[PDB]
C-alpha cells in the first residue's frame, strides 16, 4: 500500500475549465493562448486514459454548479479525479467570467466526507492562474 | 475508528508560488501548462507524479523568462508550487 490503486475500470474524469473571455467590469483582458493549453491538456490526459470534459467561459456560478454536479456522480469505478482551472486569479481565488470564487469552495465538494466515491483516491487540482501581483526578478546562476 | 482526514488525498499543482503572477505566452500557451504536458508525455509511463512535477518545476524555472517593452514586466521568472496532501505514490500506469 505504498502506491494508489490505479487499476480500477476507469482512470477517472479530467474536467478542464477554460476561461478566456471575461465581462468588462472585471477589467480582465482576453486570455490569449489559453485554447492552446486546453487542447494540449485534453490530448495529454486522453493518452493517460482519462475521460476528458472541456468547458469554456463559465461564470462563477456555473463553475460551482459544475463542480457540485461532478462531485455528486458515482466515482466508484474510477481510480482518481482531475480538474484543471485555466483563468485569471488571486491568492486562493479563481475567476469565473463574471467574478471571483474561492478555490476552497470548489475543492470542498470533493472532501473525503462529501464525495464518498472518491474517499482514499487521489484528487488532483491543476491551477493555471495568478496568485497575486508579485514579480520574480530571478537571480543569475 | 479507522478514519482518514477529510483533507487527505488532495494534490494542488499551482502554476506559480503564493502571491505571484503566473506567465502565459499568447502564442504557445502558459509556461506551466505547456511544461506540465511535455513532462507528462515524456515521463508518465515511468516516473511517480511528484517527480514528474519536480521536472515541471525545473523546466519552468530554467527555460522561461518574460520579454516586455514595459521594463516593469521584463525579464521575469516563475517557479510552480506543488502542494501535496497525498498519502501514497501516484503512477499513471498499471502493472
Amino acid at each position: 500500500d505504498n502506491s494508489y490503486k490505479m487499476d480500477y475500470p476507469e482512470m477517472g474524469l479530467c474536467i478542464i475549465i477554460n476561461n478566456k473571455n471575461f465581462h468588462k467590469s472585471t477589467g480582465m483582458t482576453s486570455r490569449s493562448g489559453t485554447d492552446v493549453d486546453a487542447a494540449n491538456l485534453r490530448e495529454t490526459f486522453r493518452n493517460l486514459k482519462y475521460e476528458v470534459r472541456n468547458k469554456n467561459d463559465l461564470t462563477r456560478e456555473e463553475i460551482v454548479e459544475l463542480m457540485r454536479d461532478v462531485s455528486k456522480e458515482d466515482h466508484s469505478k474510477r481510480s482518481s479525479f482531475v480538474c484543471v482551472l485555466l483563468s485569471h486569479g488571486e491568492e486562493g481565488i479563481i475567476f469565473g467570467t463574471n467574478g471571483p470564487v474561492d478555490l476552497k469552495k470548489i475543492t470542498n465538494f470533493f472532501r473525503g466526507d462529501r464525495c464518498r466515491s472518491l474517499t482514499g483516491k487521489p484528487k488532483l487540482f491543476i491551477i493555471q492562474a495568478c496568485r497575486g501581483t508579485e514579480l520574480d526578478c530571478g537571480i543569475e546562476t | 475508528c479507522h478514519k482518514i482526514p477529510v483533507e487527505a488525498d488532495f494534490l494542488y499543482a499551482y502554476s506559480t508560488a503564493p502571491g505571484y503572477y503566473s506567465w502565459r505566452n499568447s502564442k504557445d500557451g502558459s509556461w506551466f501548462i505547456q511544461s506540465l504536458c511535455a513532462m507528462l508525455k515524456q515521463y508518465a509511463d515511468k516516473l511517480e507524479f511528484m517527480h514528474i512535477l519536480t521536472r515541471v518545476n525545473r523546466k519552468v524555472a530554467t527555460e522561461f523568462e518574460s520579454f516586455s517593452f514595459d521594463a516593469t514586466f521584463h525579464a521575469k521568472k516563475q517557479i510552480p508550487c506543488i502542494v501535496s496532501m497525498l498519502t501514497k505514490e501516484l503512477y499513471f500506469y498499471h502493472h
Binding site: - | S15, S26, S66
Partner: peptide, 4 residues
C-alpha cells in the same frame, strides 16, 4: 508575454 502576458501575466495571469
Amino acid at each position: 508575454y502576458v501575466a495571469x
